[PDB]
C-alpha cells in the first residue's frame, strides 16, 4: 500500500459521472470519497445528480448509492463519507458540540445502534474524510478522537482522512492533522505555490508524518486534478514528470499513493485512448 488510488465521487466534475459502483468495478481505484456531507451539524448531503430522493424532512435518502457502497465493499474497496467541500454550510461552535456530532455520524452512517434516519439504509461507510475548506478548525480533532472510541463498537476497520491543501500548516485541517489519529492525508498539490511544478513541498509533509502526526503510520497522498478541466491549474499530463515525481516520493513508508478530483474526470479523461486514472495506477505499481 504505496499503490492506492483515492477518488472523490459525487460532485460530477466532468458532467458525465456514472454510478459509484461503475467506478468500483473499474480496478483503477481503491478508496472512494463520497462528496459531500456539505451541511452539519444539522445534516445535509449533496451528490449532484446521483441522488435526489429525500426523507420527509429533506435529508437525502439514497438507495442506489447504498446498494453501490455494499457492492464496492464486496470488491474490497473502501468508501468514506467526505465532510465539507466548497459550500462552507458547516461549522462547530466547540469541542462538546463536535463530540455529540461523532455519535450522530456513528448512528447515521456507521454501526451505531441509535435509531436515526439513515441516508444509506443498512449500508455502512468505512469512515470519514475531512475536506474542510472554510478556514475554521474548531471541533474536528475532538470529533475524530471521539469517533475512534466509537469505532471499537463496530465489526470492521474504520478510516479517517483529511484533505489539506499543500501549504503547511493547513488553515482548515491543520489542527486535526496535528492532534488526532488520521489514516490518510489527501494533500492537494495544485492551485497553490507548492504544486508539483511550483515549489513542491512534499518534504514538509514528510516531516509532518515522521515527527508531528500522532499516527506515525499516516499515509500521505499526492492530490491532483483528474483532468485539465477538473481544476483551474496543476493538472499533470507529462508522464515523465509523473514518473520522476512518484520516484522521489515513493522512497518512504509514509507514501500512500495518489488522490484525484474526481472519479468522473479521472475516468473519462483519456491520454489519448487510455483513462487518466489507469495511467496513474500503473505508474504507482511500477514504482513499487
Ligand atoms: C458543485 C461543487 C463542486 C465541488 C465542490 O467542492 C470541491 C472541492 O472543494 C474539492 N476538494 C477536494 C479535496 C481534495 C483532496 C485531494 C485531491 C483533490 C481534492 C479536491 C463543491 C460543490 C458545491
Numbering used by the authors: 25 to 312
From the paper:
Exhaustive attempts to obtain a complex of compound 5 with AfChiA1 were unsuccessful. Due to comparable IC50 values between AfChiA1 and ScCTS1 (9.2 μM versus 2.4 μM), as an alternative approach, we selected ScCTS1 as a model to study this interaction. Compound 5 was soaked into ScCTS1 crystals and diffraction data were collected to 1.8 Å. Clear electron density for compound 5 was observed in the active site, corroborating the kinetics data showing that it, like compound 1, is a competitive inhibitor. The ScCTS1–compound 5 complex shows the ligand filling a similar space to that occupied by compound 1 despite the lack of obvious chemical similarities. The dihydroindene moiety inserts into the same pocket as the pyrimidine methyl of compound 1. The hydrogen bonding requirements of the Asp172 side chain (Asp155 in ScCTS1) is satisfied by the linker amine of compound 5, which also donates a potential hydrogen bond to the carboxylate of Glu157 (Glu174 in AfChiA1). Finally the ether oxygen of the ligand accepts a hydrogen bond from the Ala110 backbone (equivalent to Ala124 in AfChiA1). Consequently, the absence of stacking moieties in compound 5 is unusual, though it may help explain the specificity of this molecule for plant-type over bacterial-type family 18 chitinases, as the latter group generally possesses a second tryptophan that forms a ‘lid’ for the active site. Binding of the bulky dihydroindene deep in the ScCTS1 active site induces a conformational change in the protein, with the side chain of Tyr214 (Tyr232 in AfChiA1) and the following loop being pushed out by ∼2 Å compared to the superimposed ScCTS1–acetazolamide complex structure.
